[PDB]
């Protein structure tokens, strides 16, 4: 499957924070959208997911333009999303967090939803935290639960908005491996970060954004040697 954004634009009070942004992510690859804080990464994700109105542009899955589809319909079509900010239910256990999201799985019986929660806990290395309250978890643990929550909806594409934010250096290793596993499983992964080198290493290719504009695309080695990229990190 293919998810494409074309000519996305968004302004706040006239300030153009995303301008003429186009990108593609296909099943089975990890694609980066990388650039400094404020570059427009989250805003771009918002327009793809359906969280904020776009000022311009199109969202396309395969042959179908889904620009007019509400958030819930785009999700059904395969768009999954991990917010940058905390999204876990802090008062609820890991298990209850997962079961809450799994209630949207009308294709599964109640027992099958329970089965899926157990599978997800094992896959994300959080099954030992089944009954732990979200509030009690470390940043890294919470992030694993949040990614599991995103996956519970069975998406084709997963937009990870800074999955390493608030995660200790140690926990980052496992999350990277989980993300690599997602790609291996056939998910299309679009991942944001301000730490270019760290996240680039796990990308097959990446777009670099600066002040609302795409300035470069390529493999990690191409990006690290691109003068247009160097030019904004002087
Ligand atoms: N609701 C809003 N009103 C005004 N400005 C906003 C709003 N949301 C985001 N912005 C601005 O848009 C710019 C891009 O934000 P964002 O897309 O979150 O950047 P990034 O995720 O790349 O750090 C930021 O400078 C931010 O101040
Ligand atoms: Mg952001």
From Swiss-Prot:
Subcellular location: Cytoplasm; Cell inner membrane
Domain of life: Bacteria
Main location, first listed in the record: cytoplasm
Membrane topology: Peripheral membrane protein
Residue numbers binding ATP: 35-42
Chain ranges of the ABC transporter domain: 3-234
E.C. no: 7.5.2.-
Protein keywords: ATP-binding, Cell inner membrane, Cell membrane, Cytoplasm, Membrane, Nucleotide-binding, Translocase, Transport
Gene3D superfamilies (alphabetical): P-loop containing nucleotide triphosphate hydrolases (3.40.50.300)
CDD domains: ABC_YhbG
Induction comment from the UniProt entry of this chain: Transcriptionally regulated by sigma-E factor.
Entry GO MF terms: ATP binding; ATP hydrolysis activity
One GO CC term on file: membrane
Single Gene Ontology BP annotation: lipopolysaccharide transport
Listed InterPro entries: AAA+_ATPase, ABC_AA/LPS_Transport, ABC_transporter-like_ATP-bd, ABC_transporter-like_CS, BCA_ABC_TP_C, LPS_export_LptB, P-loop_NTPase
Effect of loss of the gene: Results in an earlier growth arrest and onset of cell lethality.
Oligomer and partners: Component of the lipopolysaccharide transport and assembly complex. The LptBFG transporter is composed of two ATP-binding proteins (LptB) and two transmembrane proteins (LptF and LptG).
Family, per entry: Belongs to the ABC transporter superfamily. Outer membrane lipopolysaccharide export (TC 1.B.42) family.
Cited function: Part of the ABC transporter complex LptBFG involved in the translocation of lipopolysaccharide (LPS) from the inner membrane to the outer membrane. Probably responsible for energy coupling to the transport system.
Record-linked NCBIfam families: LPS_export_lptB, PRK10895.1
Protein name: Lipopolysaccharide export system ATP-binding protein LptB
Phylogenetic lineage: Bacteria, Pseudomonadati, Pseudomonadota, Gammaproteobacteria, Enterobacterales
